[PDB]
Amino acid sequence: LHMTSTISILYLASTHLSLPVYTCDYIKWICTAKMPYFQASEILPKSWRIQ
DNA sequence: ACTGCTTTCGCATGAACCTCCCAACTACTTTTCCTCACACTTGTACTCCA
């Protein structure tokens, strides 16, 4: 598993739903730091992070 | 002989350190992750050369 994996299963849930959203509109949504792809560990877990 | 050098003494009672090991500040290894390029071999396409 890799942070690329949480994008891939998000893309399959959007193309089974048959949306006009793509990796053109995923790499623009993560490099602009909109959905928590970069530094997701630093902010989100807060208790599982230490272990 | 009287020499020297001892020595014992003192107003109540009240209060009146040295290595060594831990710290800061750096670097360099540690302890597991996911992500592909490379080297061949069978295969299908090529045009022969008599």
For residues A18-47, b (16+ Cβ closer than 10 Å) or e, as one string?
eeeeeeeebeeeeeeeeeebeeeeeeeeee
Closest nt by CA–C1' to A5: B34
Collapsing DSSP to helix, strand or coil, A30 comes out as: helix
Structure tokens at A39: 């530094």
Way it was determined: cryo-EM
The CA angle A23-A31-A5, to the nearest 5 degrees, is: 50
**CB contact at 8 A, A7 and A31:** no
Closest nt by CA–C1' to A4: B34
Distance between the alpha carbon (CA) of A33 and the C1' atom of B35, Å: 23
Nearest to A31 by CA among A23, A21, A42: A23
**CB contact at 8 A, A30 and A7:** yes
**CB contact at 8 A, A26 and A11:** yes
- The C-alpha atoms of residue A46 and residue A35 are separated, in whole angstroms, by 18
Bases of chain B with protein Cβ within 7 A: 33-35
**CB contact at 8 A, A38 and A6:** no
